[PDB]
Amino acid sequence: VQLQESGPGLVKPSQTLSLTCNVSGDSINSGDYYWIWIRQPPGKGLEWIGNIYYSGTAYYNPSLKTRLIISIDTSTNQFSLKVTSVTAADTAIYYCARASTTVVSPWLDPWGQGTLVTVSYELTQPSSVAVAPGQTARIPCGGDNIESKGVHWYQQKPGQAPVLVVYDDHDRPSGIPERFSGSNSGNTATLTVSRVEAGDEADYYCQVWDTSSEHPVFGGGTKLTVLGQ
Amino acid sequence: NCNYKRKRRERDWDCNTKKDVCIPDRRYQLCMKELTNLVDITFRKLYLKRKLIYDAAVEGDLLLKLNNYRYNKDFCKDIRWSLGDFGDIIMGTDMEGIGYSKVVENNLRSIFGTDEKAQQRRKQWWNESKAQIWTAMMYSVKKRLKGNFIWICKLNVAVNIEPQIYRWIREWGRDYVSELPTEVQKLKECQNACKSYDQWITRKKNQWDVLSNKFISVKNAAGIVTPYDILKQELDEFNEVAFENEINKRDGAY
Numbered sequence: 001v002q003l004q005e006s007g008p009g010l011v012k013p014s015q016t017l018s019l020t021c022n023v024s025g026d027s028i029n030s031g032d033y034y035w036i037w038i039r040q041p042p043g044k045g046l047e048w049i050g051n052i053y054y055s056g057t058a059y060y061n062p063s064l065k066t067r068l069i070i071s072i073d074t075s076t077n078q079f080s081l082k083v084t085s086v087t088a089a090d091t092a093i094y095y096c097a098r099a100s101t102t103v104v105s106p107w108l109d110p111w112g113q114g115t116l117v118t119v120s121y122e123l124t125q126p127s128s129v130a131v132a133p134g135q136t137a138r139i140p141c142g143g144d145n146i147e148s149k150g151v152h153w154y155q156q157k158p159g160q161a162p163v164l165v166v167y168d169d170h171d172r173p174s175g176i177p178e179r180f181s182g183s184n185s186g187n188t189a190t191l192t193v194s195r196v197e198a199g200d201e202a203d204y205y206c207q208v209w210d211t212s213s214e215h216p217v218f219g220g221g222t223k224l225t226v227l228g229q
Numbered sequence: 230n231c232n233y234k235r236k237r238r239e240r241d242w243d244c245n246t247k248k249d250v251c252i253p254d255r256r257y258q259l260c261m262k263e264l265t266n267l268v269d270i271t272f273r274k275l276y277l278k279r280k281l282i283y284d285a286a287v288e289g290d291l292l293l294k295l296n297n298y299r300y301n302k303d304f305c306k307d308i309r310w311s312l313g314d315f316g317d318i319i320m321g322t323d324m325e326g327i328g329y330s331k332v333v334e335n336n337l338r339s340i341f342g343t344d345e346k347a348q349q350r351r352k353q354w355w356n357e358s359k360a361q362i363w364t365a366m367m368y369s370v371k372k373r374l375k376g377n378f379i380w381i382c383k384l385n386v387a388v389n390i391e392p393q394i395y396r397w398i399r400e401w402g403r404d405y406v407s408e409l410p411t412e413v414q415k416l417k418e419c420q421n422a423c424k425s426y427d428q429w430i431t432r433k434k435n436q437w438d439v440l441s442n443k444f445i446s447v448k449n450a451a452g453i454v455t456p457y458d459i460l461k462q463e464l465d466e467f468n469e470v471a472f473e474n475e476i477n478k479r480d481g482a483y
Binding site for chain 2: 031053055056057101102103104105150168169170184211214
């Protein structure tokens with residue numbers, strides 16, 4: 001199943017940005033999934049924009065609610081995002097993604113390619129973990145009683161969309177090596193990357209689901225740098 | 230707020246709050262916070278499912294803790310019973326309807342409607358959701374198993390819709406066959422122990438009388454015709470003759 005955003009890439013400031021996610025391999029006309037928009041300012045982390053249900057209902061990030069319109073069209077297998085009265089603070093890479101409605105803790109898989117556009121539960125993770133090649137990197141994710149939740153982990157290499165590497169605190173999708181493992185105890189969830197290769201250099205985000213307003217909550221991200229020598 | 234699940238049979242089946250039925254402690258403690266706090270027809274049905282999943286996941290978690298985190302068939306049975314009660318609440322066929330359960334019913338009334346065909350829609354909503362609700366109850370098991378998920382619990386026995394009184398007799402049977410050795414050994418181990426046993430066995434008869442009477446009203450209003458057929462199905466080599474003797478203090482042990 002594959003999603004993909006499509007948009008202008010450059011937008012005049014006082015105007016309104018329009019994006020469109022084309023899903024293929026599956027039908028959007030189903031209650032099995034949330035359809036989500038995520039944006040990421042250059043250099044910053046992952047911001048949730050809004051969800052939409054196949055029935056047409058959509059809810060938004062409260063800080064941007066007045067400028068967001070998320071619509072869906074079941075008869076052409078797509079849903080769209082509109083950002084009105086844009087400003088400079090809206091320059092970001094915009095991702096569309098999918099999340100299940102049938103599990104306790106939804107995660108986002110798959111994600112769109114991502115398009116650059118130019119003009120309360122909090123997870124705490126450090127900005128950087130730096131280890132030498134072959135060592136063991138441990139990326140912590142802090143949350144108040146975070147073990148009561150199911151935390152997921154995404155790997156984002158530069159220029160690419162995030163990639164799910166761990167979900168339900170220790171499950172690995174098919175394509176992920178066994179060196180990536182997950183833990184969740186007390187107030188800290190831990191992504192552990194053993195035998196850190198050079199290709200492991202990326203940003204790692206822990207994600208959790210907000211059970212009161214039904215949307216993903218992301219940590220700030222952790223840059224994993226490999227020092228070489 | 231979905232408390233820590235008092236020890237097994239710390240409180241016996243209550244037949245006094247609702248006089249026509251005997252209510253187990255598990256049902257009284259069933260987690261319903263998100264359902265209670267529920268104060269686009271398709272979207273609000275989804276929101277209900279989400280809150281039901283959250284209550285079911287907590288319920289399953291606490292039941293696992295009650296079973297000392299042992300993923301065994303004893304745990305599956307408790308998950309089977311609590312899932313059924315969730316269904317009878319959703320479908321409206323719950324026999325408790327006390328306090329907070331009256332709130333969850335009114336919340337369900339506002340979602341599906343008060344008309345006659347609403348009750349058939351709650352039955353259809355439960356059928357397309359019941360499997361997901363059962364999986365949520367074992368999400369804590371999935372979080373604690375280091376490896377893959379092994380399904381020691383079986384969906385078919387849990388997801389199959391029975392009348393509440395049917396399942397409660399299955400549960401009461403397992404409760405009775407466990408309390409009986411503890412009581413016959415507390416006597417074989419004396420005017421107080423007999424005044425204690427015969428006050429325990431009176432609770433068992435009074436319970437079985439109210440359940441079997443509730444059975445008749447439900448059955449009239451699956452290979453099971455009498456309420457003893459339920460115990461023959463659920464229990465290990467259950468003899469109805471010995472059972473009526475035990476509850477009537479005629480057994481050749483007492």
